[PDB]
Design an enzyme around this catalytic site. Structure first.
Site, PDB file in Angstrom:
ATOM      1  N   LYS B 289       0.859  -1.177   0.000  1.00  0.00           N
ATOM      2  CA  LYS B 289       0.000   0.000   0.000  1.00  0.00           C
ATOM      3  C   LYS B 289       0.908   1.244   0.000  1.00  0.00           C
ATOM      4  O   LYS B 289       1.803   1.384   0.864  1.00  0.00           O
ATOM      5  CB  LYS B 289      -0.915   0.007   1.235  1.00  0.00           C
ATOM      6  CG  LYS B 289      -1.715   1.350   1.381  1.00  0.00           C
ATOM      7  CD  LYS B 289      -2.756   1.281   2.491  1.00  0.00           C
ATOM      8  CE  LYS B 289      -3.251   2.650   2.850  1.00  0.00           C
ATOM      9  NZ  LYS B 289      -4.357   2.465   3.910  1.00  0.00           N
ATOM     10  N   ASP B 294      -2.344  10.175   4.221  1.00  0.00           N
ATOM     11  CA  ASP B 294      -3.774   9.809   4.276  1.00  0.00           C
ATOM     12  C   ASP B 294      -4.548  10.788   5.131  1.00  0.00           C
ATOM     13  O   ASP B 294      -4.608  10.637   6.359  1.00  0.00           O
ATOM     14  CB  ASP B 294      -4.002   8.361   4.766  1.00  0.00           C
ATOM     15  CG  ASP B 294      -5.497   7.910   4.634  1.00  0.00           C
ATOM     16  OD1 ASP B 294      -6.361   8.600   4.046  1.00  0.00           O
ATOM     17  OD2 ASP B 294      -5.820   6.846   5.162  1.00  0.00           O
ATOM     18  N   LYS B 301      -9.892  12.665   8.557  1.00  0.00           N
ATOM     19  CA  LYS B 301      -9.481  12.089   9.859  1.00  0.00           C
ATOM     20  C   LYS B 301      -9.564  13.156  10.952  1.00  0.00           C
ATOM     21  O   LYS B 301      -8.543  13.747  11.354  1.00  0.00           O
ATOM     22  CB  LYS B 301      -8.056  11.515   9.788  1.00  0.00           C
ATOM     23  CG  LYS B 301      -7.979  10.137   9.028  1.00  0.00           C
ATOM     24  CD  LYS B 301      -6.549   9.644   8.898  1.00  0.00           C
ATOM     25  CE  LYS B 301      -6.508   8.335   8.111  1.00  0.00           C
ATOM     26  NZ  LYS B 301      -7.431   7.331   8.658  1.00  0.00           N
ATOM     27  N   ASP B 309      -1.720  13.132  12.301  1.00  0.00           N
ATOM     28  CA  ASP B 309      -0.302  13.530  12.328  1.00  0.00           C
ATOM     29  C   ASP B 309       0.678  12.419  11.983  1.00  0.00           C
ATOM     30  O   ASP B 309       1.809  12.666  11.601  1.00  0.00           O
ATOM     31  CB  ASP B 309       0.067  14.163  13.665  1.00  0.00           C
ATOM     32  CG  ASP B 309      -0.056  13.199  14.828  1.00  0.00           C
ATOM     33  OD1 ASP B 309      -0.824  12.208  14.760  1.00  0.00           O
ATOM     34  OD2 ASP B 309       0.620  13.431  15.846  1.00  0.00           O
ATOM     35  N   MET B 311      -0.004  10.084   9.552  1.00  0.00           N
ATOM     36  CA  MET B 311      -0.371   9.481   8.283  1.00  0.00           C
ATOM     37  C   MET B 311       0.627   9.549   7.102  1.00  0.00           C
ATOM     38  O   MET B 311       0.364   9.015   6.012  1.00  0.00           O
ATOM     39  CB  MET B 311      -1.801   9.903   7.907  1.00  0.00           C
ATOM     40  CG  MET B 311      -2.870   9.366   8.906  1.00  0.00           C
ATOM     41  SD  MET B 311      -2.910   7.549   8.773  1.00  0.00           S
ATOM     42  CE  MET B 311      -3.441   7.173  10.447  1.00  0.00           C
ATOM     43  N   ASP B 314       1.567   5.968   5.864  1.00  0.00           N
ATOM     44  CA  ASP B 314       0.571   5.136   5.191  1.00  0.00           C
ATOM     45  C   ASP B 314       1.112   4.582   3.883  1.00  0.00           C
ATOM     46  O   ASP B 314       0.409   3.920   3.076  1.00  0.00           O
ATOM     47  CB  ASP B 314      -0.716   5.912   5.038  1.00  0.00           C
ATOM     48  CG  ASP B 314      -1.924   5.031   5.051  1.00  0.00           C
ATOM     49  OD1 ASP B 314      -1.960   3.916   5.667  1.00  0.00           O
ATOM     50  OD2 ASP B 314      -2.840   5.461   4.352  1.00  0.00           O
ATOM     51  N   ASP B 374     -11.983   7.378   3.329  1.00  0.00           N
ATOM     52  CA  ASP B 374     -10.840   7.017   4.190  1.00  0.00           C
ATOM     53  C   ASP B 374     -10.617   5.489   4.117  1.00  0.00           C
ATOM     54  O   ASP B 374      -9.725   4.919   4.783  1.00  0.00           O
ATOM     55  CB  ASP B 374     -11.129   7.464   5.640  1.00  0.00           C
ATOM     56  CG  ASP B 374      -9.869   7.493   6.536  1.00  0.00           C
ATOM     57  OD1 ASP B 374      -8.728   7.293   6.054  1.00  0.00           O
ATOM     58  OD2 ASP B 374     -10.007   7.743   7.748  1.00  0.00           O
ATOM     59  N   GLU B 376      -9.384   4.141   1.526  1.00  0.00           N
ATOM     60  CA  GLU B 376      -8.766   4.330   0.214  1.00  0.00           C
ATOM     61  C   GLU B 376      -7.739   3.275  -0.167  1.00  0.00           C
ATOM     62  O   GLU B 376      -7.558   2.996  -1.353  1.00  0.00           O
ATOM     63  CB  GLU B 376      -8.163   5.721   0.110  1.00  0.00           C
ATOM     64  CG  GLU B 376      -6.723   5.865   0.634  1.00  0.00           C
ATOM     65  CD  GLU B 376      -6.609   5.583   2.116  1.00  0.00           C
ATOM     66  OE1 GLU B 376      -7.596   5.744   2.872  1.00  0.00           O
ATOM     67  OE2 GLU B 376      -5.508   5.214   2.526  1.00  0.00           O
ATOM     68  N   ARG B 378      -7.740   0.087   0.234  1.00  0.00           N
ATOM     69  CA  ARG B 378      -8.297  -1.091  -0.462  1.00  0.00           C
ATOM     70  C   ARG B 378      -8.638  -0.825  -1.934  1.00  0.00           C
ATOM     71  O   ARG B 378      -8.623  -1.735  -2.749  1.00  0.00           O
ATOM     72  CB  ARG B 378      -9.481  -1.678   0.296  1.00  0.00           C
ATOM     73  CG  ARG B 378     -10.788  -0.906   0.197  1.00  0.00           C
ATOM     74  CD  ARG B 378     -11.761  -1.463   1.199  1.00  0.00           C
ATOM     75  NE  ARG B 378     -11.309  -1.140   2.537  1.00  0.00           N
ATOM     76  CZ  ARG B 378     -11.962  -1.374   3.667  1.00  0.00           C
ATOM     77  NH1 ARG B 378     -13.179  -1.941   3.672  1.00  0.00           N
ATOM     78  NH2 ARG B 378     -11.399  -0.969   4.810  1.00  0.00           N
TER      79      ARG B 378
HETATM   80  C1  LIG Z   1     -12.972   3.549   6.972  1.00  0.00           C
HETATM   81  C2  LIG Z   1     -12.585   2.245   7.671  1.00  0.00           C
HETATM   82  C3  LIG Z   1     -13.543   1.064   7.436  1.00  0.00           C
HETATM   83  C4  LIG Z   1     -11.166   1.854   7.286  1.00  0.00           C
HETATM   84  C5  LIG Z   1     -10.164   2.785   7.971  1.00  0.00           C
HETATM   85  N1  LIG Z   1      -8.944   2.629   7.228  1.00  0.00           N
HETATM   86  C6  LIG Z   1      -8.122   3.655   7.253  1.00  0.00           C
HETATM   87  O1  LIG Z   1      -8.372   4.720   7.811  1.00  0.00           O
HETATM   88  C7  LIG Z   1      -6.826   3.434   6.560  1.00  0.00           C
HETATM   89  O2  LIG Z   1      -6.942   4.064   5.293  1.00  0.00           O
HETATM   90  C8  LIG Z   1      -5.748   3.966   7.528  1.00  0.00           C
HETATM   91  N2  LIG Z   1      -4.458   4.194   6.924  1.00  0.00           N
HETATM   92  C9  LIG Z   1      -5.565   2.861   8.565  1.00  0.00           C
HETATM   93  C10 LIG Z   1      -4.995   3.339   9.877  1.00  0.00           C
HETATM   94  C11 LIG Z   1      -5.761   4.157  10.720  1.00  0.00           C
HETATM   95  C12 LIG Z   1      -5.227   4.562  11.944  1.00  0.00           C
HETATM   96  C13 LIG Z   1      -3.944   4.148  12.307  1.00  0.00           C
HETATM   97  C14 LIG Z   1      -3.190   3.330  11.459  1.00  0.00           C
HETATM   98  C15 LIG Z   1      -3.720   2.921  10.239  1.00  0.00           C
HETATM   99  C16 LIG Z   1      -9.812   2.356   9.389  1.00  0.00           C
HETATM  100  O3  LIG Z   1     -10.659   1.781  10.096  1.00  0.00           O
HETATM  101  O4  LIG Z   1      -8.661   2.532   9.868  1.00  0.00           O
HETATM  102 MG   LIG Z   2      -7.694   5.986   5.036  1.00  0.00          MG
HETATM  103 ZN   LIG Z   3      -4.811   4.749   4.548  1.00  0.00          ZN
END
Ligand SMILES: CC(C)C[C@H](NC(=O)[C@@H](O)[C@H](N)Cc1ccccc1)C(=O)O
Ligand SMILES: [Mg+2]
Ligand SMILES: [Zn+2]
Ligand SMILES: CC(C)C[C@H](NC(=O)[C@@H](O)[C@H](N)Cc1ccccc1)C(=O)O
Ligand SMILES: CC(C)C[C@H](NC(=O)[C@@H](O)[C@H](N)Cc1ccccc1)C(=O)O
Ligand SMILES: [Mg+2]
Ligand SMILES: [Mg+2]
Ligand SMILES: [Zn+2]
Ligand SMILES: [Zn+2]
Lengths: 510, 518, 518
Positions: B289, B294, B301, B309, B311, B314, B374, B376, B378
Site C-alpha cells: 500500500k 492519508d 481524519k 499527524d 499518516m 501510510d 478514508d 482508500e 483497499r
Molecule cells: C474507513 C474504515 C472502514 C477503514 C479505515 N482505514 C483507514 O483509515 C486506513 O486508510 C488507515 N491508513 C488505517 C490506519 C488508521 C489509523 C492508524 C493506522 C492505520 C480504518 O478503520 O482505519
Molecule cells: Mg484511510
Molecule cells: Zn490509509
C-alpha cells in the site's frame, strides 16, 4: 435463596419452560432411494446448483405422487433459482385430492455449506413454518451434509422455530427427513433434541431481563436444574465467600442489592473418573459499568442483561451432560454470579482489592469487572485439582473489532487444550478462532502500588490484555478462555444465540 | 519524474542515506573456545542463569588476560544478577597495563530468548554505546542462539544504533560518534560468520524502509517516492517501469486513480522486477500500500484518536516492498522471478477529490460504491491486485497499513495475515518465524460478504453493519484475485513504534525470508 | 498595491474602511465645574456615586447656573434615587429661559475608584441614553474622581461604543443620528483638556482595528489587508514595504510560506516604519499575528467549541499593530523608530496545503516538525520574529490570538503576557495600567521545553504531552529570538467581545502607550 424486592411487584424467580412444543415433534428419517411420499403438510427440497451461481432449481428425487411430480418437472422448476436462502412454496392437490404444500430452499452453488450458510437455509425454512398452519414438515436433502452438519441443521431448526413467549401477556407434530444413507443419520436426531434444549435453556436465562434474572434467582434456577438432573450442587453465599477471601469477586458485587452467589454444580460419571474438567462462566446479571458507567455512544448498556451469557452457556452444558451422561469424567460447572451497579456501596476506580490467591489488584476501570470475578473463580477452579479449566465470558467489546459477530476468540496457556477446543468448534459447528496471548504486553499490567493492574492504560488490544490478566490466576493447570462478547447476542434477530453450549458439550463428550 | 512544488522551498526529493555509519563497522566473529582478548574499547558479556530466579552473574568464557580474569571471578560477580535488560560497567587495567572497559547485559533465566526479549537485550547494549566515545565494541555470547536469532541480534543492534539525522540542521548530534569495529565471540563461530553480511543487508533493507516511512509527506510524495524506487532499481540493476496517469487511464485503473484525484501529485505506479539467471521455478508479486499521506479525504481524519499527524506512514507497505527489493536484489536468489509493485498516490481534500457515494470502476470491470473516502487503501490495492494477477504469478502477497482495528485485535507487536490459500499462509508464518517478525493468522469470515452487497454498484467498498473492519477489508481485496494464491498482511498496528517515535521498517525481513525460503 | 484574486466577479476586491467617522465631527468642550453648569439643549448627565453607602442616595453637588434646574436637582428630590452602578434616570423640566431641557444621571456605585470594567459599565449606560433619542448635544458632569488616564479612557470608550459599524448593511441600515457636541464639566479642567484629542486618536486606532477584525474573510484576505496597510502608510507618511512570495522565498521564510500554501491568496508580509525626525534613542518592532481566516487546515476546526465561524478574527494581532501605527503616525512621538510587522496569510484546506507531519525550515534555518496544522500562528510568528530581530531593534513585542486555552486561564477580560526579559514585561504591565487594557504576566516554564524535542526535526511545533498550550506556544516562539528583549501578548481570549458580538480592537492603546511612554 430468598430474592430481595424493592416493591412487591418485583419478580422473585426466572420463568423457565422445560417442556417445549419442539419436544412433541415426532421425527422420522427415510432413505431417499425408493422415492419420497408427499401426502400432507409442507414438503421442502434443499437444492443447490454447483458452479452455476443463482442457477435454476432442478429436483433429482423421485416423488411417488403424479400431481406433485408434474409440479416438480424441470420446466416448472427452472422458473426458480438456487440463490442461498431464496424459497418458494405452493399449495396444490396431490393424487388423493388432498391439499399439500411443496417447495424448496435454495442452497447456492457451493457443494459444502458452512454453518453460516446452513443457518441461512434454516431461517428461510422457519419463515415458511411461521407462516403456514401445518401438522407436518418434510425436508428432502438434495445437498451433501456430514453427520455433524445434519445434527446442526436439526438443532438450528428446533431453536429458530421455538419462540420465547414467557414475557408476553400451533407447531408441527411430525418432521420427516429424506436423505441418502438415512440410517447413518438417525442417531443424530435425539442428540440434536438435547443440544437444542441446552441452547434454548441458555437462551432463556440470557433473554430473561435483569429484574427477573439476578444473582439470587439465577443461582436458584441452577439449583433447580441440578435437582432435575441429579447433579451435586452447592451455592456459596457472602459469608463463605468472605471466608475464602474472594475479594476481587466480592468487590464487584458491593454495589448491588442482590448478595453474590457462587454456583458450583458437579457431574460425576458412574465408573472410574479419568478426566476432571472445570467450566467457568462469567455471570454478571447486569453490567452497568459501575462508576465507569456505560454512558459512551455504542456502549450498549441496554443489552447488558446478556453479561451472564458465559454462565448460561455453562448451565446449558450442564443440562446436556446431565442428560447424555458421558462416562469417565467429572465436570464442575462454576460461575461467580453478581451484578455491577452504581451505589454509595460500590467499589471505585483506583480501589486496591485482594484476590483469593493473595494477589493485590489495582482497579483501573470498574467496567472491567468480568476479569475480577473470573480471577477468583479461576483460583477456586484450580483448587479443585482438575485436568482442564475452560472459561467462557462476554469479556471485551474489542471482540467486535477483531472477529466480529460470527467467531468467538479462544486464548489459553496450553496448545493441546486449545486444539481440543478448536476440534469441538468443528464438530459443534460453533465457530471459534485461536488468538494469541502476547507476553510483550504483560508489562503494561505492572501496577505502581498493587501486585498487578486490572487494565492496561496503554495497550488497546484489550482482549489480549484481559487474557494476560486471567492467566495470572492459573498457576499450573491447562487453561483456555473463550471470549464470546461479539458472538453471544444475535443483534439482527434481537435474541441470544445461546452460543457455547454445544461447543462445551462436544468438548466434554469427545 | 519532476516533483511539482507550490513554493520554491518545497522539497523535490527524499534525502536517502545509502552508506551509513553502520556500514563502516568492521565486524569480526571469533570462536569463544579460543578465549577472549580484552585489549580495548568496551567488552560486553551476554549472561543468563537458566531456570534460576534473578540468579548471579557467572562468566563461563576463557579470558586471555590475568587482570581481567581476576576481576571477573565468581566472587566479584556474585553481587550482580542476570535480570533481563540489566547491565553493568567495569573498569580495570589489563596485562598490558592498558585500561579497558568491560561489563554485561542480563539475559534472564529462560534458556531460549524471544524476539521481544532479544530486543530488550539489544536496547540495553545500545544504551552503553550511547554517550560513550568508543572505537570498538566486543560482544561475548554466553547464551545460546540459533543462526536466525544471532542474525536478528545483529540486525537489531545495527538498526537501533543508527540515528536518522536527515532532517536535523541546527539540532545535531554533538556527541554522537560510532564504533569502527565490532568483535563477536560465539560457540561454533564458523557457522555464524555467514549471518554477518546477511544481517547487514537485512539491516539496510529495513533502515531504508524506515527512511522512506519517516520522511514527511512534503518530502515523500507519489512523484519523489517513485523517483526513489527508480534510483534503487538502477543501483541494483533491477528492471523497472513507473506507470503514469496516461497509462493508468489506458489500463482502466479507476479505483486507484479516484483516490489520487484530489492530490497535486500525479499517481505513479511502481513496478520493479528481479529475475534469477537460471530456470525460474516460482513467480511472486509483492504489493505494498503506497499512500504517501492519508488525510481520509472528504471523510477527513477528524475523530479523536484518528492520528492524522502520523499518516505519512501510510506508505509503510510500499516501503517494505522496496526494502525487500533491496535485500532480494542484493542477495540475488536463484529460481525466482519477483515483481515489486505499489500503486502510489496521496489521499487529499480538494475540489477535485473523489466523494463518499461515488461509483468508480476497477480495472477488472467491477463497479464499486465508495462508502467512505478514508477506506482508500483497499481501492488502490484492488487495482494493484488486478495488475499483479495479470502477470501470471504463483503467489501474490500484499502488505498494507490498512485498518486501525488491528490495534484492538493484535495490537502493536504482531501483524495479522489473511489469505485465500493455506499453503501460502503457512509459508508466510514460517517466514515470520525465521525473520523474527511476528505475524498471526486471522480468518476471512465469508458470512460478512453479504454486507458488501451494494444496491447500485457491483460491490460496496465498506460494510454497513460489520465492525470487524480488518476482516471486511480482506473480503473486499479477495474480490480482486480470481484464481491465484493470495495473502494480505495488515501492518496498521505494527508499523510505527509509538514509544520510540520512529518506524520499525516492519515487513522487509519477513518478505525477504519468504522469497529466499522459496 | 496588488490585485486581489477573485473566484467570481462578485467577490470583493478591498476592505471597506471608514476614516471620517461621525465621532470625528463631534465638537468637544471641557469646562471647569467651579464656574457652574449651564443646562440647555440636548441631554445633561451627572455621573454620581456615594462612597461607603452601597446603593446610597443621589445628591448633586455641582452648582447649576439655573434656578429651575437647581430646584429640580435639590437633595429632597434626588434622594428618592440611588447610585447603583449602571443605573440611570431621565428628567424633563423648563429652565429659567422657559426652554425645556433634559437632564439625568448615571450611577457610579459606592466605590471611589472605578475599575476599567466599572467605567465601561457607566459608559454603556450613557450610550443607551444616546441611542433611540435624537440629540444634538450631550453634556457630562463628573461628580466622581478620575485621574487623567481614566478620563481619557472614559472618552475613548464612549466614542468606541457609540460608533456603529454599518459597512456591511445594505437593506437594514438603522433609519441613528449622532450628537454634534459634547460638553464635559470636571474639576481642574485645564489639566484634563490635553486628554481630549489623545482620546480621539486612540478611539480611531481602536475603531480602525475593529473595522479590520470585523471585516469577513472574503473582504479581508492577505492581499486586501496588506493593500489597506499600504493605504494607511500613505495617509500617515510612514515608510512601507510589502514582501510578496518571491522575496519571501529568497528570505527562506519556509514556516510562514507553508501555512499559506493552501490559500488562493499569495502571502503578503507587511512592514511599516515610523521614524522620529530627531536622534533615534529606541528602536522597537511590533509584530501582529495576521491570519485572515483560520480553518485549522487539515487539522480542521470541526470539534464542538472550535468556533470556526469566528476565525475572521485571527488577524486581530495584525489589526492592533496597524491601529497602533495609526496612533503613532498621528501623535508623532520623538526619539523613536518603530517597525510594524505582520506575516499575513490564510490557513485553508486544499490539494496544496501543508500537512500534519510536514517538516519545514524557518528563515533562521531551524527545522520544524508540524504536529497540528491548526498551530499555524506560531509558525508565521517564528519567521516574523527572525525578520524582526534582523532589524536590530531594542525590543520585540508580538501580539497574537494564539491559543484557545487563554479562555480557560485568564478568560475574556485580561490578556496574558509572556517574555524573556523582565524589564520589558514590566514596561508592558505599566502600559496596561496607563492604557486601561488589562494584561497579566504568565510564566514561560522551561520544564516543558523538552516536550518540543522532535525525533527528526530540530524542534516540534506542538507538545504531545503538555496541555498548557499558551506556555508551550511561548516556548516555541522564544526559540526564534536569539539576543533581544522580547514579549508576547496572547489575546485569543480578549479580542472578541462575545456578548456584544463585535471586536474590542484590543491592544491598540496598550501598544501605543508602550511606545509613547518609552
Ligand atoms: C474507513 C474504515 C472502514 C477503514 C479505515 N482505514 C483507514 O483509515 C486506513 O486508510 C488507515 N491508513 C488505517 C490506519 C488508521 C489509523 C492508524 C493506522 C492505520 C480504518 O478503520 O482505519
Ligand atoms: Mg484511510
Ligand atoms: Zn490509509
Ligand atoms: C475497559 C475494557 C478493557 C473492558 C471492557 N469490558 C466490558 O465492559 C465487559 O465488562 C463487557 N460486558 C463486554 C462487552 C462490552 C460491550 C459489548 C459487548 C460486550 C470493555 O470496554 O471492553
Ligand atoms: C493545536 C493547539 C496547540 C493550538 C490551537 N491554536 C489555534 O487554533 C489558533 O491557531 C487559534 N487562532 C486559537 C483560538 C481558538 C479559539 C478561540 C480563539 C483563538 C488551539 O487550540 O488553541
Ligand atoms: Mg464491565
Ligand atoms: Mg489555528
Ligand atoms: Zn461485563
Ligand atoms: Zn490561528
Amino acid at each position: 435463596s430468598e430474592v430481595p424486592q424493592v416493591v412487591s411487584l418485583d419478580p422473585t424467580s426466572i420463568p423457565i419452560e422445560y417442556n417445549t412444543p419442539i419436544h412433541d415433534i415426532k421425527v422420522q428419517v427415510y432413505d431417499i432411494k425408493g422415492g419420497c411420499n408427499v401426502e400432507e403438510g409442507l414438503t421442502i427440497f434443499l437444492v443447490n446448483n454447483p458452479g452455476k451461481e443463482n442457477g435454476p432449481v432442478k429436483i433429482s428425487s423421485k416423488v411417488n405422487d403424479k400431481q406433485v411430480s408434474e409440479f416438480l418437472k424441470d420446466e416448472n422448476m427452472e422458473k426458480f433459482n438456487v440463490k442461498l436462502g431464496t424459497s418458494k412454496h405452493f399449495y396444490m392437490f396431490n393424487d388423493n385430492k388432498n391439499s399439500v404444500a411443496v417447495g424448496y430452499v435454495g442452497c447456492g452453488s457451493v457443494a459444502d455449506l458452512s454453518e453460516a450458510d446452513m443457518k441461512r437455509v434454516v431461517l428461510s425454512l422457519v419463515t415458511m413454518l411461521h407462516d403456514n398452519k401445518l401438522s407436518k414438515l418434510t425436508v428432502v436433502f438434495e445437498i451433501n451434509v456430514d453427520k455433524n452438519l445434519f445434527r446442526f441443521f436439526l438443532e438450528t431448526l428446533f431453536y429458530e422455530y421455538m419462540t420465547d413467549e414467557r414475557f408476553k401477556s400451533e407447531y408441527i407434530k411430525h418432521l420427516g427427513v429424506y436423505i441418502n444413507n438415512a440410517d447413518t443419520y438417525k442417531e443424530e436426531v435425539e442428540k440434536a433434541r438435547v443440544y437444542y434444549f441446552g441452547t434454548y435453556y441458555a437462551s432463556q436465562l440470557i433473554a430473561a431481563p435483569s429484574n427477573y434474572c439476578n444473582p439470587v434467582s439465577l443461582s436458584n434456577a441452577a439449583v433447580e436444574l441440578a435437582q432435575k438432573l441429579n447433579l451435586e450442587y452447592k451455592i456459596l453465599g457472602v459469608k463463605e465467600l468472605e471466608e475464602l477471601k474472594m475479594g476481587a469477586y466480592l468487590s464487584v458485587g458491593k454495589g448491588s442489592m442482590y448478595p453474590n452467589k457462587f454456583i458450583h454444580l458437579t457431574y460425576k460419571s458412574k465408573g472410574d473418573v479419568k478426566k476432571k474438567i472445570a467450566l467457568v462462566g462469567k455471570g454478571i446479571t447486569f453490567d452497568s459499568g459501575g462508576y465507569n458507567l456505560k454512558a459512551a455512544p455504542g456502549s450498549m448498556i441496554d443489552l447488558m442483561k446478556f453479561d451472564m451469557s458465559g454462565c448460561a452457556a455453562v448451565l446449558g452444558c450442564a443440562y446436556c451432560v446431565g442428560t447424555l451422561k458421558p462416562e469417565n469424567v467429572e465436570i464442575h460447572f462454576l460461575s461467580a454470579v453478581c451484578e455491577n451497579m452504581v451505589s454509595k456501596n460500590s467499589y471505585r476506580p483506583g480501589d486496591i482489592i485482594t484476590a483469593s490467591n493473595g494477589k493485590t489488584i489495582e482497579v483501573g476501570n470498574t467496567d472491567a469487572e468480568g476479569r475480577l470475578t473470573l480471577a477468583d473463580a479461576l483460583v477456586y477452579a484450580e483448587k479443585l485439582g482438575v485436568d482442564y479449566i475452560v472459561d467462557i465470558a462476554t469479556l471485551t467489546g474489542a471482540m467486535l473489532y477483531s472477529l466480529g459477530t460470527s467467531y468467538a476468540g479462544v486464548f489459553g496457556n496450553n496448545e493441546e487444550l486449545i486444539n481440543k477446543i478448536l476440534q469441538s468448534s468443528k464438530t459443534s459447528n460453533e465457530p471459534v478462532w485461536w488468538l494469541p496471548i502476547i507476553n510483550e504486553y504483560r508489562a503494561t499490567l505492572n501496577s505502581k502500588y498493587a501486585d498487578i493492574n486490572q487494565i492496561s492504560s496503554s495497550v488497546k488490544a484489550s482482549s489480549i490484555v484481559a487474557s494476560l490478566f486471567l492467566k495470572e490466576f492459573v498457576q499450573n493447570t491447562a487453561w483456555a478462555h473463550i471470549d464470546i462478547a461479539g458472538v453471544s447476542w444475535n443483534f439482527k434477530a434481537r435474541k441470544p444465540k445461546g452460543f457455547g453450549v454445544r461447543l462445551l458439550t462436544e468438548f466434554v463428550l469427545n
